[PDB]
Ligand SMILES: O=c1ccn([C@@H]2O[C@H](CO)[C@@H](OP(=O)(O)O)[C@@H]2O)c(=O)[nH]1
């Protein structure tokens with residue numbers, strides 16, 4: 001069972017950082033969205049457009065998937081996204097990321113019925 | 125089993141205009157620090173001072189805890205803290221918080237050996 005001391009540090013300590021940072025986004029979001037458990041996911045992109053806009057990409061430009069599958073689609077317009085990339089300093093479990101705000105076209109794999117995004121392939 | 129569609133939303137969607145804004149700190153932190161599992165913790169404070177300074181409080185001014193326990197201590201000096209409070213809008217599993225930065229004395233309960241902070245009681 002997590003110690004009371006450890007619980008206090010988890011719930012109440014942020015030594016660490018300040019809320020006024022813009023660059024801590026990936027650190028917190030990768031943790032929030034459970035991509036730092038077991039190991040640090042090295043690269044992950046968050047999309048800030050609406051879910052409807054991202055789902056719409058599945059009806060947009062058919063493109064080659066980086067993994068050679070044939071179910072990828074490129075957005076017709078650039079989207080506001082954030083790339084989270086694990087730093088060289090980063091060491092599990094202290095997963096550290098650089099946050100890069102970008103506006104690029106996204107490529108996603110679509111699947112299911114209705115066809116919706118199931119994998120983020122790349123940005124271009 | 126987490127659906128592929130849901131996994132994509134978790135890994136890659138963060139819809140909004142100012143994702144990295146300071147106003148989003150509590151949303152991100154409350155999630156990352158596991159205070160939005162099951163229910164939204166209604167009120168929570170993060171402390172931006174060194175862990176040594178917070179541990180030091182355990183040898184500072186004795187005060188009675190809000191709950192009548194007798195192991196609380198008030199910081200001799202003010203500390204940089206952030207309050208996270210649920211908004212009217214907020215409802216599980218969509219926990220929403222208002223982020224507020226203040227400088228206040230903290231009151232914590234101390235326990236264990238060494239005696240360290242185990243509960244965040246109040247700020248004054
Ligand atoms: O720009 C990119 C490129 C890649 N990935 C991400 O990196 C992993 C390997 O490609 C993929 O994770 P995964 O194969 O565990 O779902 C994911 O799409 C991104 O999130 N953004």
Ligand SMILES: O=c1ccn([C@@H]2O[C@H](CO)[C@@H](OP(=O)(O)O)[C@@H]2O)c(=O)[nH]1
Nearest residue numbers: 011012167168169170243244245246247
């Ligand atoms: O200023 C405050 C006041 C309260 N709490 C918080 O509210 C809960 C019950 O009061 C406590 O969480 P807990 O019951 O998991 O210890 C916590 O200290 C704060 O984090 N800051």
